[PDB]
Amino acid sequence: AKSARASRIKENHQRFKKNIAGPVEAARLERLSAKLMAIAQA
Amino acid sequence: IGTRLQEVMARIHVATPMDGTTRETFIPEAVKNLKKYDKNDPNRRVLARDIEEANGGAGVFNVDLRKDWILENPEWKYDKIPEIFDGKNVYDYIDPDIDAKLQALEEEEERLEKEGFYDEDDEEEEEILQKAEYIREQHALIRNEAKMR
Amino acid sequence: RSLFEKPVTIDTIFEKDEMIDVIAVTKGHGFVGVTARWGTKKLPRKTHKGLRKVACIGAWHPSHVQWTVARAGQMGYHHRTSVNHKIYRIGKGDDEANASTETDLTKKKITPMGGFVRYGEVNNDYVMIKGSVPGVKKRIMTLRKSLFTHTSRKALEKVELKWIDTSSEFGHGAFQTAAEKKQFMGTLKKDLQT
Amino acid sequence: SHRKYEAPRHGSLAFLPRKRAARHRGRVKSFPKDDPKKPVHLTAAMGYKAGMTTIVRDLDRPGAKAHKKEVVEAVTIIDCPPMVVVGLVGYIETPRG
Amino acid sequence: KRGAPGGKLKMTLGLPVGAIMNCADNSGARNLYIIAVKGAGARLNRLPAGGVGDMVMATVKKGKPELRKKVHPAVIVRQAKPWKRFDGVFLYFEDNAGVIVNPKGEMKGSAITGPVGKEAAELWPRIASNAGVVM
Amino acid sequence: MRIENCFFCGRPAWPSKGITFMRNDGKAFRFCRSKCHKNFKMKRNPRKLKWTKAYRKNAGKEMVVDSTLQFAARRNVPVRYNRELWQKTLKAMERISEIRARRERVFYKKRMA
Amino acid sequence: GVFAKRTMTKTRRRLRDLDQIERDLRSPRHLQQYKETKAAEDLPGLGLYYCIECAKWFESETSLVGHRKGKPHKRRLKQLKEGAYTHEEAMAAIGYRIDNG
Amino acid sequence: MAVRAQFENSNEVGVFATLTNSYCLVALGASENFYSVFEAELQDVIPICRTTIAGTRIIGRLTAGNRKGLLVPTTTTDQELQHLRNSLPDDIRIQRIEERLSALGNVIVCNDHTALIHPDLERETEEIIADVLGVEVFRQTIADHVLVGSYMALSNQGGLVHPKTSIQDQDELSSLLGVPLVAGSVNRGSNVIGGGMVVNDWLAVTGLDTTAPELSVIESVFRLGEGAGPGAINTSMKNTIVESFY
Ligand SMILES: [Zn+2]
C-alpha cells in the first residue's frame, strides 16, 4: 500500500485540490463572504 | 448403453409436444427495423457507457433514475414525493378513487350531524358528592391517626 | 471595524454540505486505572496485588520507569481537534419547521419531545453535524474551517435529508409529535375529567 | 531477551500528557493559511453542544453499495445563537513568532 | 483468489473459531465446526470471527462419514448475534447456519433449507440462486 | 422510508428503533423496543398483556368499526405518480385525522357514560 | 422446574412458537418440514413418539400418555383453544389491512 | 442473437437481470456496462429499468414476470415500487405479493402463455400469478429441483433445462408447456440455467464463460438469429455436442 506520506499520493491529492475541490470551495467562499459583507455594510 | 453415453444422448435429445402446436410469439415490429450496433461505426448510438465516460467515468458519474419516468405531465418527473405526514404514511392513503370516498365520508359526516351523533349533554347530586368527599377525607385522617399511634 | 457591535449568524460563516473541524474538551472520567485508561489486557483471576494492572513496568534497563509505560491517572477532559465533520443542516431559529424535510411534511422543530435530556430546548439557529464530536452536553464548542482543501468526494457530496428523528430521548419514544402521541393513545380519563 | 510475539503499543504517544486541559474553552491552535486574493471572511465560530438525534439520508455516493438508497446516520446538534463582534486584534511577525 | 469477498460492509461478527453452526444445504452434513475465518487479521489473543456472508473453514462433526475427514470452505448464511444494516435495522436469525462451497463460491449441495441473509445472497450469486427465501 | 408498527404492542416503529427477529420459516417480527422483544422472547401473549393494542382490540376498548379507518392500507398495486393526487391525498389525510379523532372521543364517552 | 433457568431466554435455548404449532396441526406438510429439519436417530424414542401440541418428543407411548394428563399439556391445549397471536391479528389490532386490488 | 456479458466480472446474468417480451430490469451497479449491453441490444424498443429490490442487487432472482405483468416480493419498498411503476408503461400490471418464498425469480419461471412454480406456494399466490401474468400455472420440479425459476430458462420459442433432466421428463414437460425443450448447460458446465442466462423471444444474454457449443444450443432452442431452429441440434450440431459434452 502507498502511505499517506507518499509522493505519488501527494501529487494525486494536489491535482484533486487544484482541479475539483477548488472551484467548489471558491464558490462557497464567495457566497459566504457576500452574505457577511452584507451584514457588515448593513 | 453406458451412463456417460446415456447422458450425452439426453443432451442431444430434443423434446417436442405430441400435438405439434406452437406458441404464438410477441416479437415487436421495430426489431427487424433495428440497425445492429457497431463499435467502429461513427454514427453509432450513444450509450450509457459513453455518457458516463464523458461525465466522469465509473464511480464519479451520477445516474438520473427519473430520466426514463413516464408521467402524465413531464414537469412532475423531478418532484419531491411526500412520504410522511403527521405520523402517517402517504402511500398508505394513496388511492386513485379517493374523491368518491371523501365525498361519501363527508355525506356521512353531515348526516351524523343531522341526527346529532356528536351532541353533548344537579345541585343536590353535587352536594352529595362533596359530602362523600369530605367523609372520605375524614376516614383518611382517622386511618392516619391509627397508623401513627 | 464595520463588524463592531454587530451579531454574526452561523450561516454566514459556515454553509450546508461543508466539512469543518470541531475543537472541544472531552468528557471527564477522573482518576482511572490502566485497563480503561490505556486498554491493557487484564491479568488472570485472583492475581496477587491486583489484576487491573500491568505486570512489568520496568523489567529491563535503565533502573527507571519509562515515560512510555502505561500508568494510572487522569482520563478524559483532554483538548481535542477533530477534523472533517460534514454539516448536514443549518437550521434557523425563527423557522417553525426546521426539522421538516421535503418528504416529511410534519411541521416540527429540532427539539425532541420532552426536550433535550439535560440541555433544554434549541430556540436558536442550530448546526447538524454528521457523527460525534469531542464535547458533552452544555459544553462550548469551537467550529473551524478546514485548514486544507479537501481530497474526498464526501466533502463535495450534497446532503439530502428525508426524515429527522424528534422522538423523546428520555426513553423509548415512539412519537415525533404530541399530536401523534394523542392520536395513537386516544381519549384519556383526565381528558374527560378536565 | 526479545519479545516472543509482536504486538503494537497501547495508546498513542502523540496525545501525551494525559492531563486535564488548561482551559475549559477549546483553543484554535492553527487558523487556515491566509490568501490575500480571497475575499474577507471569518475562520471560526462558537456553539453549544445540545445533544444527538437520528436522520434518514438519501445517499448519492457513486461506487458505494448504499448508492441511491436510504441510510440511517447519527448526528449531533449544536445550538448556535449569533455571536457579537466586540473587538479587533493586530499581530506582527517577529523572529520569536 | 482467497475466499474473503470484496464489497462487504462492517457488521457484528457473532461466530468465532470453535463455534458449531447448523448445515443449511443438502450435502449430507448436519453441522459445521469453525476452525478458521478467511480474511481474518493479526492481533494478539484475538479469536478470528466471521459473520453472515463470510467464508470460513469448517470441519463436519456429524453427518455423512465421507465429509468428516476433510476441511471445507463454507459461507455463513444465518447468525444469531444481532447486527445492524445500513438502513438502521438491527436484526438476528434464530440460529447460526452456513453452506459448504468450493473456493470459487459454487455450492456442493443442490438446495438450501430455510432463509439466507441479504449479505450472503448479495455476495454469493450461487447462494442467491439456490435460496428459496432471501431475508 | 415508511412507518412500521410493532408486532407486540402496535406502537409506531420509526427507523432505527427496536429490533427485528428473523424466523427460519420466513417471517419477520418487528419490535419497537426491548420491552416488547423480551416479552416475545419470554413468549407472553400480547392479547393478554393489558398495555397492548391487541388486548385493547380484544376487549373492545378501541374504535374498530368505523368508516375513517378504511382509508389506510398496504397498497400492493402501485399507482403512477400524480402531483394533484398526492396533494389531494394530503388534504384527505388531514380531514380524516380530524374526523377520526372526534369520533374516537364520542366512542370513549359512550364507553364512560 | 426448568433446567438451567439462567439462560433459558438465549436464542440457542429457543423452543417452537404457538403459531408454528397451529400450522403444524393444520397442515401435515409444515410438520413434515419441521421433522426433516431434525435427525431421527438423535430423537427420543427414535422420533416415533411426538406430541404436536407440546412440540416435543418422548421416549415411549407410556411417557406420551403420561404427559397428556399433566398441566403443561393442558396449558398448551388451552392456549391453542384461545388461538396464537399472528400478524393478521396484529394488523387487526390497529385497523390495518392489505389492499391487493 | 445471443450475447455474452458480465455484471462486475460475474457470469451469472440471471441473478442481476430480468428479461421479458416488453421490458428489461437491470441491477443498479457502480458502472454502466451491464446496462449498456442490454441498451445496445434493445435500442429503445422496450424500456430498461435500473432497479433495486429490497435493498439488494439480485433482482433477477427476486423478481418474476412476462410481457403482461411483474411480481415483486413483500420486502420491496414503496419507493422501489413507485420507481418501477413510473418506469414501466400502464400496459404492464405490477403487483407486490405476500409469498413466504420471497425469491420469486427462483420459485417462478414463466413465458407469455404458461408458468411453472415451486410446489409449496400458497393458493392465493397461485391465483395472483394466474391473474397478473395471465398464464396457466403448474406445480413442477426440474430434475428433482424445486427452484424451477433458477434451474430453467423459458421463452415462447422454447426452453433450456437442467442438463441432468431425463428424456421422459423433458417429453412430459415439453408437452405440458407447448414449447420444444432441450437439456444443456451454461457458463462452461453450470447447471444453473435461470441464474446463468436471461432470454426473451428474440434476444438471449448469457455469461462470458458460456462456450460456443452451448451458445449454439441456446441459439437453436430459442430460435435466435437467421435460420435458427431446435432441429439443428440433432442434425447439424450433433457431432459438435457429442465431441464437447461426452
Ligand atoms: Zn412495541
Curated annotation (Swiss-Prot), chain B:
Subcellular locations according to the entry: Nucleus, Nucleolus
Domain of life according to the entry: Eukaryota
Residue ranges the record marks as coiled coil: none
Function per UniProt: Involved in the biogenesis of the 60S ribosomal subunit.
Family, per entry: Belongs to the TRAFAC class OBG-HflX-like GTPase superfamily. OBG GTPase family. NOG subfamily.
Protein's name according to its UniProt entry: Nucleolar GTP-binding protein 1
